[PDB]
Amino acid sequence: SWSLSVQTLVFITSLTFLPAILLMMTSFTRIIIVFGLLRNALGTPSAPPNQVLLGLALFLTFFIMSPVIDKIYVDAYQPFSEQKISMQEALDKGAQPLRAFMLRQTREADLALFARLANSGPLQGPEAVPMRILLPAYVTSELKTAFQIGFTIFIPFLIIDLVIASVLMALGMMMVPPATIALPFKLMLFVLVDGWQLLMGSLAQSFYS
Amino acid sequence: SWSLSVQTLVFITSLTFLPAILLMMTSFTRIIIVFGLLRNALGTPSAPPNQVLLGLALFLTFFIMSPVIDKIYVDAYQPFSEQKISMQEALDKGAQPLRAFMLRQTREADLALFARLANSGPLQGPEAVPMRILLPAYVTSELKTAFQIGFTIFIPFLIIDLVIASVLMALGMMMVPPATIALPFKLMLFVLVDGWQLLMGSLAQSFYS
Amino acid sequence: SWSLSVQTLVFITSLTFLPAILLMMTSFTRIIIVFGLLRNALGTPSAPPNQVLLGLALFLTFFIMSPVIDKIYVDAYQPFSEQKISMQEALDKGAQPLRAFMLRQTREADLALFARLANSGPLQGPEAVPMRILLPAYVTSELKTAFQIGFTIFIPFLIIDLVIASVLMALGMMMVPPATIALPFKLMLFVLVDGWQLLMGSLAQSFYS
Amino acid sequence: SWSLSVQTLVFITSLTFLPAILLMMTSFTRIIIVFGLLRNALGTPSAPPNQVLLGLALFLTFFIMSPVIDKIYVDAYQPFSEQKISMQEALDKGAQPLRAFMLRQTREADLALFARLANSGPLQGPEAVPMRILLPAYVTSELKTAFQIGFTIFIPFLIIDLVIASVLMALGMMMVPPATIALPFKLMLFVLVDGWQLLMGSLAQSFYS
Amino acid sequence: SWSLSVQTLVFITSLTFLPAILLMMTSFTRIIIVFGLLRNALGTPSAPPNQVLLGLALFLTFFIMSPVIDKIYVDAYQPFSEQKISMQEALDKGAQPLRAFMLRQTREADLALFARLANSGPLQGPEAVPMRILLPAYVTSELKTAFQIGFTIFIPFLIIDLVIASVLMALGMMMVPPATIALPFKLMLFVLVDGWQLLMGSLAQSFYS
Amino acid sequence: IALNDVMADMQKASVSMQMGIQVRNKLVAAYQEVMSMQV
Amino acid sequence: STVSFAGQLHAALDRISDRQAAARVQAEKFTLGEPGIALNDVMADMQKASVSMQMGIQVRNKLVAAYQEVMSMQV
Amino acid sequence: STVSFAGQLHAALDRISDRQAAARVQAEKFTLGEPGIALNDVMADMQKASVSMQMGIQVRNKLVAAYQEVMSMQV
Amino acid sequence: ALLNIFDIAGSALAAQSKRLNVAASNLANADSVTGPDGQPYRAKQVVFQVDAAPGQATGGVKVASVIESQAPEKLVYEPGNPLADANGYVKMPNVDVVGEMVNTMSASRSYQANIEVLNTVKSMMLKTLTLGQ
Amino acid sequence: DRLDAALRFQQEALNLRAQRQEILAANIANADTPGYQARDIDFASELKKVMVRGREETGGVALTLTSSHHIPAQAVSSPAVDLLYRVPDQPSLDGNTVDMDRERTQFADNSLKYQMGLTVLGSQLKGMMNVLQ
Amino acid sequence: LDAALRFQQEALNLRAQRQEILAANIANADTPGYQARDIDFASELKKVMVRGVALTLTSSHHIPAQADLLYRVPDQPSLDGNTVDMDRERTQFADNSLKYQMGLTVLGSQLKGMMNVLQ
Amino acid sequence: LDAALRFQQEALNLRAQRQEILAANIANADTPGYQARDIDFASELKKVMVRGRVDLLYRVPDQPSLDGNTVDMDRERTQFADNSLKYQMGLTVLGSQLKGMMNVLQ
Amino acid sequence: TSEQWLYWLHLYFWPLLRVLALISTAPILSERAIPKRVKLGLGIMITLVIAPSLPANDTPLFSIAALWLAMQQILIGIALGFTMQFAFAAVRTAGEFIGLQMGLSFATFVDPGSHLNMPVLARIMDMLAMLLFLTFNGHLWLISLLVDTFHTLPIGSNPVNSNAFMALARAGGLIFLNGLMLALPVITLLLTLNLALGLLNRMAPQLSIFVIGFPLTLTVGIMLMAALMPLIAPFCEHLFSEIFNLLADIVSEMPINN
């Protein structure tokens, strides 16, 4: 094991990789893309991302990864504390739940491409795939899913836009700017049905399924 | 040879020059410019630049460079490990495979321009071009290739924009803002075609052909 | 002469003054300003600032300065090898090719401004100008040259934007964002022309004629 | 007199107070503010701040303060070298031209405010102002003057922007972005007038009216 | 007492604590925050923070504290110098003026919070509050006062934004970027109204009321 | 208390405080880097 | 009741100062000619006072370093 | 009138300079051979002057550090 | 290099000093016929014990209880001098001169040893301060 | 923790070196007392004992900690190390078995090894501080 | 402040003056009728510690300016005149040199403490 | 400037010259008819301070000797010891000034 | 001053860490205008007042196994300050949408890199709400709730329970709800104006809202929001109180749920 040397190098450097690699390893990509897309509907930002949307995605991904963090805690933070498990079985035991989490959301042909271009030979089982292949495949799959969710969210607001424009132009309103009319209708649809809770719950459910 | 002075001096300087010159000398320029241009289409950014596209581009360039880096490894790191090679023949033994790789992608005429503005004499073969000529030629050729890929990427979404606009006008949509109408259709087009997989695959297959 | 004290004391501080004064007294101002203005055209960054444009500019200006640096080498470094020259005549010996270059590039009336505002006496010839008056004159004239080049760069993409907008307007397209359609055509005009080679080469040619 | 004790102890601390206090005591406040505001006009930064504008401002301030520096030289340094002057008489000898120079540029009402809020008793003449009053008053006057120059510089580019926008949307080009069309015209306007000479000459000559 | 024993160890550490605590315990937080917010308005910073705003704030806080510093000097330094006071009653003799100044500036509700959380009992009079309570209340009150001032300073410049944006939209100047047009108008808004003198004077007046 | 004990205690506490501060610096930097992206 | 570690630092400084003052007054008394006080006792107490003073100086240095480091965390 | 920071620093620097000048005058007198002045006084006063100058240098360092700490922050 | 080694070596210094002062008194007052009240001077010795008797472990020397040597108090015979009793015998203090020479010799050597021990421990402790930095 | 488990050994060794140091200086200080019976301790066995068991210093009690102004006082305390007798050469008629040469070469050795321990702790702590900056 | 050094300063200076006096006693060991001298160190040191006006300070060129031998009771009369007893003088001289060295060490240590506080 | 070390530097140089003179005295303490010499340190120091870069006065003799030699060895020994001590003092004073000047500086 | 203290100086670190998290995240505390040293010193100089009467004993383990304790404090700070940002987002939505009604944002409609509307009306109402917050007891209730968290969730092996980050996630939620409930009268009146001036197109399709409508709607919006500026002052009360209650709830939900 490591010796008061490298320990507190690998730790501080891991904290350095945290915000980018570790946050885009797990979640907060799908959620942030979906939130931004929802912000494209309903008009302008009207939600200060540096202040609110990013923090909401942060809280939502904390909630989402509560099970995997709990299992990591059980497998490592009990045994690794003071006895019988030292940073070698701890690493694989703590990798297992996150890796299962990522593999459970990755499209089954992303891994295909990233293996076929890493010149990896046969991969025996689902557990045999390494993080080297698992990371970009998970990122690409999560981008696909985020775009699907955003498209479904765009559906009803697109419907409202077209129906409002149709009503205005059919009733004779030759050349009114239907966008300003539609925006409060967008809000009404989004609040009367209690839209935010529906969105966060649907994301949370679909995220692991 | 060198004596653990300039060794471990040129090593640290090489590390400092890594992030800028090495990355913009090998790959990840074409990939990142093509990602930026794809982000231009599909509407808003809607994918975080500073974290996810950078990480995915790094992973793509690592996978593409693995044959180059493996040749460099077998030609330096074993033979530089203590025997018959110490960071003088290590440099050129490692440069040759990278030089061949970069030559394989340079436009035939960028080399010509940079050689002619160096007042360099006649050159006999591809082994005669020096790194001085070979860096900027590769960079310029890479920018051209990136912009060509940019066209091929903008084409279909331009089609969607124009067809939505034409339908809206013929129907009599006086001044509906067709951009908001076309954005979800752009996302839909890019998800059914399975665009992230097939895009990163197309970049990879392009990049060494 | 100087005695391995102040020699090697002027050397280290000269290297300290390098990054600003020396890269902005020779070239790399006109080139970087043209590159930045070009990047304002064609829409978004489309080239990483701190990495590819800056590095390509550094290479390019090394290539323009290679004749002046060759003459500075012949007139300073070789004789400064222990014999008949040590940092006293060596100073103006190494200045003279650079002063000749800058004079050959300066506006013939910026010298007038920075001389008359210095209460400097009447000048007999080009050789009688001091470095003092020469620096700001060269900087101002180089800014003028860079902005002229930038205006000429903005010409054709302005043409493309106007023609695209006019076609859309004639077709009746009230509210289409003509920039979105015009951007791929901007890159179009910039690659079929083979714009990077032409621009790099024309900068080099303009810089000495 | 001081005895190579406090002398060369006040010299080194004088040099450490140099970069902020002395450079913001003379000029290079007005010049830098005017250049920054000019750079907000004419579009993007498009000029390397920490590289060209700072150096040009340094040279400009050298030239503007040169009569002050010569008077300080003649009245303080050579008399301070070896005979009848030692760092107390030297202080007023070297301050008097500087205090006169700052008085000539102060607003005739900033001194009033700072003298009245420093409980200063009646002031007999221009020479009764203490340095304590004259520093911040000069700073405030300098800030006012810099912003005045700034608006006066903004004016013509505001003209270009507004005329281009009016022409565009009068012609029917309802929503082509006028900034993109205008930027080449801003550069053209500022290069045909030979904008850099006019600006720096006017700044210099304003700074002694 | 102490005998050139721990004295001159406590003195030097007092000098260490000078810059942070003694400039974040007296003034120069309110002024510096107001200047920062003022730079947030008026568009771009264009005022060299490390030098000019910092220097002006430091001079203004010195002018404000000249009475407090005078009272601390007269009741501590003159007596602490050689006779009847030495670093034992020096502290309270120098603290009473600073306490009176800090109490005259505290919002009356912060003391309530910090006494209610420090578990201290009822406080009979103004004097009864100690340093352990006085400091956090003073900093909280200073933050509150600084932001009240700073946002009241914003309000007119956002009025300018409102009027210019609304006029451009009324004329139909579709998407002319109203910030660029507003910036020079904000500048004359801030110079015709005699901005810097009025601001400095209002801060100095408010800072003792 | 032993003198060597006092200095060993000094240095151990100093190292511990340094490590805690550096860890907090990394975490705060990560938080701000996450909060400064585009959405 | 309470420790108020600023009070602990005050106590340490008072201890250091009192020890140095005691050594100084003992040297005072001895060189003055006062019978009793021995030379080896004077020198030993001066030695101990010197060590305590360097104790205080080292604690000063490390406290100043610690404070200059806790004022570097970004918030 | 006021504390007059500039005046106070001037007074401190004058004190240090006149102390060193007086010590140098005393050494001047001794080496020149004037009776009166003693070797032990010369060395003691020159060491005291060294101590005073060192105090001045330390205060200078702390004040310069303070000034540069104030002037680095953003506004 | 604990601080309770200053106490031990300092106590050793004090004990050696007192023994040496007593031996100097012995050597000086050899052939001192009378005491102030009028008595032969009795040559004295100092008693060395370990300091801090109870519990402790080992540490330091104490010179408590200066005693009086029981040499047979040599006589001379001068029945012309007063202070000589019946069978005139001046009582003549009992000092073993060579023994006292050697006592001073060894006392100086041991004192020097302990002085050195003090210096060495202080150097140890001052380099203890440079722990870390 | 895990900071004071890696530095624990050198800390304990260096404290034990200081304890053996005042044992040896008690040997030196009692150079010429009668019947002293020079003491010493076995460093390796005692260090192993300290690592396995702890400190467990035997014998020491301070007063209580009531309201201020109650005159703190402490009993005579001694480390739990079992003092071992040093086997003497050259009997000396007064029981004192303190041989200057043996005690003094041991003193110099112990001093040098204490300095070595200081160097080792300084190196480890500088390494820790170099990681964290 | 910085007059804490005054006491050992004066003590060392007084030791040096006493050294000069005792050297004079030794030098005059054999001159007839010398009648040896000394000073009382405790009284002189107390007197110096317990106990100076700067002149007029008008315009420059103003010229600022400024500026107990006890008898040792003799033993062994001579009627060769002198009263210097060599044994007493030698012991006093050796003691004085030793105490001068002590004072020098103490003053140097105070200066070292002051200088160590400053870095 | 940097003529603030001039006084002690010239004093130390004159002290070295006086050392040479006194060593010559000791060496020729036996040559017949030598007429021992010396220099007046104060007057020569003042003379070198007022103008810059030394008359050999004759040490007034006591105790004639019929060989003409006037080196009275006891006076020469005392003066040589005094000069050596003053030279070491000058070394310490110059060292202190240079220490101070380089302490203020870095 | 030894580790006899210098590990009792481990009494300051965790409360300091939590206070610093709140300060770096809180609405008023974490404004970029404040010099960083002020915020840090306020954290240290609040914990010094709160640190006694906080019985805390833990260990900064090498290769910290107790970093999951540090996490805890940071998280609680993120709970308290960031949530209080919702109250601002609400108005930063409401006023924004008001601009989206009048004319100010048709650049954000059909397509760009410039939004230009955040500077216009959202920053009016957001800093108006900034002042409304401060003027109470704005600055302080957050700090008092932080002390209350110190007393309810001091330091523990079970720091955070699941099912409790949904509370803050689906909390806003009330961002949209309250932004609407504030901007509803203005939106409804300008809907009436827009539909009326559209009905004018029935008499003549030439009336061209680009020419007639926008100058009318801009004046209507400016005048009307001037008339309905005071309506914010009661709303902000709500806008803060409820969110406090939510925080209060979760702060008092956590102990009985642990």
How many Å lie between the alpha carbon of E84 and the closest alpha carbon of chain K? Answer: 13
Q: Reduced to 3 states, what is the DSSP secondary structure of residue B119? A: coil
> DSSP class of residue I84?
B
DSSP state of B127: G
Token pair of A193 as six digits: 């049905």
Experimental technique used to determine this entry: cryo-EM
CA angle G20, G22, G24 (to 5 degrees): 70
Alpha-carbon span I61 to I18, nearest angstrom: 12
| Half-sphere exposure of residue D34: CA atoms within 13 angstroms, side-chain side | 26
| Residue E149: φ, ψ to 5° | -60, -50
Q: DSSP H helical segments within chain M, as ranges?
A: 3-6, 10-25, 36-50, 67-83, 86-102, 123-134, 138-152, 165-169, 174-203, 213-227, 232-257
* Number of neighbours of residue D106 by Cβ within 10 angstroms: 21
User: What single letter denotes the amino acid at residue M38?
Assistant: V
Which tokens go with A22?
């570790």
Of M56, M54, M58, M28, give the one whose Cα is nearest residue M42.
M28
Coil/strand/helix, residue B118: coil
Whose tokens are 């004391």? That residue is C9
Contact by Cβ (8 Å): E132, E19: no
CA M87/CA A99 separation, integer angstroms:
38
Contacts of J12 in chain F (CB under 8 A): none
Contacts of J1 in chain M (CB under 8 A): 59-62
Residues of M with CB under 8 A from a CB of J: 59-63
Cβ distance of B32 and C55 shorter than 8 Å: no
CA dihedral C68, C74, C80, C84 (to 10 degrees): -120
Return the closest-CA partner of residue K12 out of H21, I116, H47.
H47
**What tokens appear for I62 in the block?**
């104490």
Structure token pair of residue M149: 């968290």
Angle, CA of I22, I25 and I26, to the nearest 5°: 90
Q: Which residue has the tokens 């989206």?
A: M100
Euclidean distance between CA atoms K114 and D13, whole angstroms: 24
D52 and E76 Cβ atoms separated by less than 8 Å: no
Beta-bridge partner residues of K38: K70
The bridge status of strand I61-62 relative to strand L37-38 is unpaired
Label residue I83 left, alpha or beta by phi (over 0 means left) and psi (-120 to 50 means alpha): left
Q: How far apart are CA A201 and CA M167, in angstroms?
A: 12
User: Token digits for K89?
Assistant: 């003088």
Is the separation of the CB atoms in I121 and I6 below 8 Å? yes
Among all chains, which residue has been given the structure tokens 């080496």?
A: H31
Residue of D6, C173, K99 lying closest to H19 (CA atoms): D6
Tokens 């550069």 appear where? D187
Bridge partners, J84 (sequence order): J40
Q: Are A175 and B175 in contact (CB under 8 A)?
A: yes
Say which residues have a Cβ less than 8 Å from residue A149's Cβ, sequence separation at least 6. A30, A33, A34, A37, A203, A206
- Residue A105 token pair: 């959301």
- Discontinuities after residues in chain L (C–N over 2.5 A): 53
Is residue E13 a contact partner of residue G68, using CB atoms and an 8 Å limit?
Answer: no
Contacts of H42 in chain L (CB under 8 A): 89, 93
The b-or-e profile of F23-39 (16+ CB within 10 A means b, else e) is bbebbbebbeebbebeb
Nearest of D165, A179, B41, A39 to residue M106 by alpha carbon: A179
Do D132 and D106 meet the contact criterion of CB atoms below 8 Å apart? no
Determine contact, residues M91/M125, Cβ cutoff 8 Å: yes
Q: Which of J17, J19, J23, J33 has the highest number of chain I CBs within 10 A, making it the mutation to test binding with I? A: J33
- Residue among A28, A49, A38 nearest A143 (CA): A28
Other beta carbons within 10 angstroms of residue C40's beta carbon come to 20
Closest Cα in chain M, distance from residue G41 (Å): 29
DSSP per-residue codes, C118-161: TTPPPP-SGGG--HHHHHHHHHHHHHHHHHHHHHHHHHHHHHHH
Chain breaks in chain H (C to N over 2.5 A) after: none
Count Cβ atoms below 10 Å from residue C184 Cβ, excluding itself.
21
d(CA M213, CA M219): 10
Q: What are phi and psi of I84, to 5 degrees?
A: -105, 125
Write the single-letter amino acid at C71: K
B187 contacts in chain A (CB < 8 Å): 37, 147, 150-151, 154
- Rounded Cα gap, residues G68 and M40, in angstroms: 13
CA distance A91 to A87: 6
Q: Rounded to an integer, what distance in angstroms lies between the CA atom of residue E158 and that of residue M121?
A: 8
User: Chains touching chain H at 3 or more Cβ pairs under 8 angstroms?
Assistant: D, E, K, L, M
Q: Does residue H59 belong to the interface with chain E, where contact is any CB pair within 8 Å? A: yes
| Whether the Cβ atoms of residue J78 and residue J17 lie closer than 8 Å to each other | no
Please enumerate in sequence order all residues whose Cβ is within 8 A of that of K82, keeping only pairs 6 or more positions apart, or say none. Answer: K28, K29, K30, K31, K32, K33, K34, K35, K36
Q: How many CB atoms lie under 10 A from the CB of residue A23?
A: 23
Peptide bond into J95 cis (omega under 30): no
Contact M130, M87 (CB under 8 A): no
Secondary structure class of A1 (helix, strand, coil): coil
Across chain E, how many H-helices and E-strands are there?
9, 0
Q: Name the token pair of I33.
A: 């016929």
Handedness of CA M130, M134, M135, M136 (dihedral sign): positive
Which residues are CB-neighbours of D205 under 8 A, at least 6 positions away? C117
Record the tokens describing residue J3, joined without a space.
């900071």
I90 CA to chain G: closest CA distance, Å?
Answer: 35
Question: Are residues M1 and G2, on separate chains, in Cβ contact within 8 Å?
Answer: no
| Residues A147, A162: Cα–Cα separation, whole Å | 22
Q: Residues D187, D189, D193, D198: is their CA dihedral positive or negative?
A: negative
Please return the burial class of M21, using the count of CB atoms within 10 Å of its CB with bins 0-12, 13-18 and 19+: buried
Residues of chain L in contact with residue D8, where contact means CB-CB under 8 angstroms, are 101, 104-105
Contacts of L20 (CB under 8 A, 6+ apart): none
Q: Is F5 on the interface with B (CB under 8 A)?
A: no
Handedness of CA M240, M242, M244, M247 (dihedral sign): negative
Cβ proximity of I73 and I40 under 8 Å: yes
The span from the CA of B184 to the CA of B191, in Å, is: 10
**M90-116 b/e with 16+ CB inside 10 Å = b?**
bbbbbbbbbbbbbbbbbbbbbbbeebb
Distance from CA of D172 to the nearest CA of C (A): 7
Give residues with Cβ within 8 angstroms of M55, minimum separation 6.
M154
Is the CB of residue B207 less than 8 Å from the CB of residue B105?
A: yes
Q: Mapping DSSP to helix (H, G, I), strand (E, B) and coil, where does residue E193 land?
A: coil
Determine the Cα–Cα distance for residues M169 and C170; give it in Å rounded to an integer: 50
**Whole-angstrom Cα distance, residue D149 to residue D152?**
5
CA distance between the termini of chain J: 21
Looking at chain M, which residue has its C-alpha nearest residue G75?
M24
Kindly state the tokens that stand for A23. Answer: 């946050």
Q: Contact B68/B101 with Cβ under 8 angstroms?
A: yes
Distance, CA of H37 to CA of H42 (rounded, Å): 7
Q: How far apart are CA J112 and CA J118, in angstroms?
A: 10
Contact (Cβ atoms closer than 8 angstroms) between residue D177 and residue M112? yes
Residue of chain K whose alpha carbon sits nearest to that of G51: K113
- At D81, which amino acid appears? S
CA distance J22 to J17: 9
Residue I121 has a CB neighbour count (10 Å cut-off) of: 24
Which backbone phi and psi does D70 adopt, to 5 degrees? -65, -40
Residue of H38, H48, H57 with shortest CB distance to K5: H48
Closest CA to I124 of K41, M104, J21: J21
- H/E stretch holding I9 reads helix I4-28
As separate numbers, helices (DSSP H) first and strands (DSSP E) second, chain G gives 2, 0
Of A48, C156, I83, C98, give the one whose Cα is nearest residue F38. A48
Residues of J with CB below 8 A from I127's CB?
115, 118
Which distant-in-sequence residues (6+ apart) come within 8 Å of M97 by Cβ?
A43, A44, A46, A183, A184, A187, M179, M183, M187
Residue M66 neighbours by CB under 8 Å, 6+ apart: M58, M59, M60
Q: Is D87 exposed, middle or buried (0-12, 13-18, 19+ CB in 10 A)?
A: middle
CA distance F19 to chain M (A): 8
Q: Which residue has the tokens 């901005």?
A: E195
**Can you spell out the DSSP letters for B162-187?**
HHHHHHHHHHT-SS--HHHHHHHHHH
As a whole number of Å, the CA-based R_g of chain H is: 18
Number of E/M CB contacts below 8 angstroms equals 122
Six token digits for residue D20: 């902020």
Taking an 8 Å cut-off on Cβ atoms, the answer to whether C158 and D56 are in contact is: no
